[PDB]
């Protein structure tokens, strides 16, 4: 079950259930982490699980989420995410103050406002994902490592911040199977 490690909260795979299928309104955000795994249509069973229940669903792309531009988009097409719940940026990030929950999956540096700070990399002064305004964030990844940029993101010792700790693929199977 869940238990508090260093300054952050490790969540089960129970608990991601528990709070996304009692959750209204959950955004999804994917990231290079989903690309790694190929968690892509287990994440696409989840979301039909969770609107099954009657949840509200939608995914949130940031322009340099993955490593190649479109990245998400094309990885969710594969798994037959409907277009019209996919959101670009700069007209979902508003939405994250509405949502119970902010489901991040293999996703880091987009989130991060530490991450644009270098000139040399592809996310440099673009806007962030606002992730924190959501009721609970929740982030899939195998540890507390770092992601492209190389930086440590403070998301992960908010209040509001449940880490999931394992393979984006597995560890969303998990939730599946938890769900139902
Ligand atoms: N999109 C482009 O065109 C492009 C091209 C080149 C570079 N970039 C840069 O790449 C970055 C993109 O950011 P993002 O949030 O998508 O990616 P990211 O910050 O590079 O990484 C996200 C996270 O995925 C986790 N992960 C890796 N393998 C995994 C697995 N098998 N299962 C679950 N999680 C896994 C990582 O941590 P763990 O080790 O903890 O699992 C990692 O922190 C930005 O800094 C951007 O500028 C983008």
């Known amino acids: 079950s869940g238990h508090i490690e260093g300054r952050h909260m490790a969540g089960s795979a129970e608990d991601a259930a528990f709070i996304m299928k009692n959750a209204s309104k959950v955004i999804i955000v994917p990231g290079y982490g989903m690309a790694v795994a190929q968690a892509q249509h287990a994440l696409r069973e989840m ?90 964030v929740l982030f899939i990844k195998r540890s507390m490592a770092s992601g492209y940029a190389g930086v440590e993101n403070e998301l992960f010792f908010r209040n509001n911040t449940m880490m999931l700790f394992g393979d984006a693929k597995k560890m969303t199977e998990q939730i599946v199977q938890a769900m139902n």
């Open 47 to 136: 979301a039909d699980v969770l609107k099954k229940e009657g949840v509200e669903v939608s995914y949130a792309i940031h322009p340099v989420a993955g490593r190649m531009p479109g990245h998400m988009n094309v990885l969710l097409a594969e798994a037959n995410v409907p277009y019209d719940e996919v959101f670009e940026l700069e007209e979902i990030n508003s939405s994250f103050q509405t949502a119970d929950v902010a489901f991040v999956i293999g996703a880091n540096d987009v989130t991060n406002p530490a991450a644009k700070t270098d000139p040399s990399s592809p996310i440099y002064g673009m806007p962030i994902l606002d992730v924190e305004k959501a009721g609970t």
